[PDB]
Write an enzyme that holds these catalytic residues in place. Structure first.
Site: not given
Ligand SMILES: [Ca+2]
Ligand SMILES: [Ca+2]
Lengths: 237, 58
Positions: A45, A96, A186-189
């Site tokens: 993603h 993913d 959020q931002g670690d994905s």
């Protein structure tokens, strides 16, 4: 990373920052992990909807720690091609994972090095280390300095008791403490979840999703790399 | 403008930090927000221009 501590240079040489590039600055939107000198591993993603064959305005940064200072270790290389898992399912977040081919080769040293993969099918156990420059609280701000957090892995069935049986696929792995407070955000994905149950450090998971961040009873969900080892080796060519 | 332009912005469950635009009806403005990378709702645009063209005027 919520509830973590600062990393030090050289501690996680496999950690990458995946950035969008502009004239005069760049913006970190995901993490990634070094597989080899030409390839990085990230979440699907993180790249979904991009121009996979001719991506523009994308780069990885290796040897990064503190984004507020030039520490001399940083290697900045643009992404030349994206390999999104052919069976990526955007709605279910199945498969993913993606690979980033770099337009140049990384040079390996004490601060920049690949992370080993597990054997296909291998199940990770015990405490794992998740790292990244994601937000430090749900819906909060991001840190200049790379964060690390240690959290116990959670079994599928326990994780399914939390989210629902059909919401956690077999190829997903969960991690976090029951009281919450420690998680990826959020931002670690696309960033690394690292295990060590085999006596050596290896890449067990890729930061993917969760219900908020660091919430009690809702551990973070990760793409389980052991399901995709054969895929990585086949595509990182 | 479409009624979906009136919906609050939705980050979703995924953990990217992707900057997207949404129409803020109360302020009457296209505004930035953090999109997590999956499960986007319709009030979610890749540029201010896309947002204004879609949700701009009644
Ligand atoms: Ca730096
Ligand atoms: Ca699993």
């Amino acid at each position: 990373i919520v509830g973590g501590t600062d990393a030090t240079l050289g501690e996680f040489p496999y950690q990458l920052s995946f950035q969008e590039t502009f004239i005069g600055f760049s913006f970190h939107f995901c993490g990634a992990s070094i597989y080899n000198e030409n390839y990085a591993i990230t979440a699907g993603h993180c790249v979904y909807g991009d121009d996979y064959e001719n991506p523009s305005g994308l780069q990885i940064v290796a040897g990064e720690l503190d984004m507020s200072v030039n520490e001399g270790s940083e290697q900045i290389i643009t992404v030349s091609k994206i390999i999104l898992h052919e069976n990526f399912d955007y709605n279910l977040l199945d498969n993913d994972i993606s690979l980033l081919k770099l337009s140049g080769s990384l040079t390996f040293n004490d601060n920049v090095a690949p992370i080993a993969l597990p054997e296909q099918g291998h199940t990770a156990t015990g405490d794992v280390i998740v790292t990244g420059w994601g937000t430090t609280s749900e819906g909060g701000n991001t840190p200049d300095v790379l964060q690390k957090v240690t959290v116990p892995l959670v079994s599928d069935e326990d994780c399914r008791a939390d989210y629902g049986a059909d919401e956690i696929l077999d190829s997903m792995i969960c991690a976090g403490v029951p009281e919450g407070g420690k998680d990826s955000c959020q931002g670690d994905s696309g960033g690394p979840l690292a295990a060590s149950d085999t006596g050596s450090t290896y890449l067990a998971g890729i930061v993917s999703w969760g219900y908020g961040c660091a919430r009690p009873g809702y551990p973070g969900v990760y793409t389980e790399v052991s399901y995709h080892v054969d895929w990585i080796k086949a595509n990182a060519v | 403008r479409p009624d979906f332009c009136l919906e609050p912005p939705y980050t979703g469950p995924c953990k990217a930090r992707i900057i997207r635009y949404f129409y803020n009806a109360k302020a009457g403005l296209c505004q930035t927000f953090v999109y997590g990378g999956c499960r986007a709702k319709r009030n979610n645009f890749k540029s201010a221009e896309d947002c204004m063209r879609t949700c701009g005027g009644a």
